[PDB]
Amino acid sequence: MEFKDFPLKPEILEALHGRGLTTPTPIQAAALPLALEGKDLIGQARTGTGKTLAFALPIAERLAPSQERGRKPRALVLTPTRELALQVASELTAVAPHLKVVAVYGGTGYGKQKEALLRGADAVVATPGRALDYLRQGVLDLSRVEVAVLDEADEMLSMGFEEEVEALLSATPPSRQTLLFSATLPSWAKRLAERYMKNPVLINVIK
């Protein structure tokens, strides 16, 4: 089916069609019906096969806009690099225009990112190190997080972010919906899913 056939807010559809996106890729077609209704998923898919929208869309659909100054984020996306955090934050911003998205990453100063958070955030896309930092400073509050996404989990293992990722997940409420994306499923990823997810459906589109 095309995107227009799924139960997506009109504004989200408008955003998709404007960029010539009309038909879900394999990972999106299998994941969306599950994700849209709140279920935990594990997604195995390579880069370039549309994994990003497979979680951006469900975030866009679940979260209503809010006007509350200083509000805590309701969605958390963790990525292994500053580069990927900025790409993902840009995409989420495109498909979810009703939300305030804030990217958070190392390699720069603390000032600009901290002002954005304190002013208010609906969704935070972040590398694990910089997220922990702001959590530890009482700047990033993860207690209202309704959706948590691990993007390229096997890569975060590779970058050495495991202790940090676990701490960040622990901080979110168990009431959360969890989405783990990863090309490979190393021992650490499996443990993570047993520990943080609820009866996740595994979807694999690798050749």
Instruction: List all residues 6 or more positions away from 191 whose beta carbon is below 8 Å from its beta carbon.
Output: none
- Other C-beta atoms closer than 10 Å to the C-beta of 120 total 16
Cα separation values, 92 from 41, 53, 69, 77, 206, Å: 19, 8, 21, 10, 24
Q: Output phi, psi for 65, to 5 deg.
A: -60, 155
Question: Domains (ranges, CATH) in the chain?
Answer: 1-207 (3.40.50.300)
| Location of structure tokens 């530890």 | 136
Which experiment gave this structure?
X-ray
- Other C-beta atoms closer than 10 Å to the C-beta of 160 total 11
d(CA 194, CA 47): 24
Instruction: List all residues 6 or more positions away from 69 whose beta carbon is below 8 Å from its beta carbon.
Output: 119, 120
Known binding residues for AMP: 23, 28, 49-52
Cα separation values, 70 from 110, 113, 139, 161, 176, Å: 18, 14, 10, 28, 21
Contact 197, 38 (CB under 8 A): no
CA neighbor of 91 nearest in space, from 67, 125, 45:
125
Tokens standing for residue 194: 């047993």
Q: In the Cβ-directed half-sphere of 193, how many Cα atoms lie within 13 Å?
A: 20
Please give the single-letter amino acid code of residue 146.
E
Known binding residues: 23, 28, 49-52
Pairing assessment for the beta strands 147-151 and 101-104 based on DSSP bridges: unpaired
List the 101-104 sheet strands across, edge first. Answer: 101-104, 123-126, 75-78, 147-151, 177-181, 41-44, 201-204
CA neighbor of 74 nearest in space, from 123, 136, 127, 3:
123
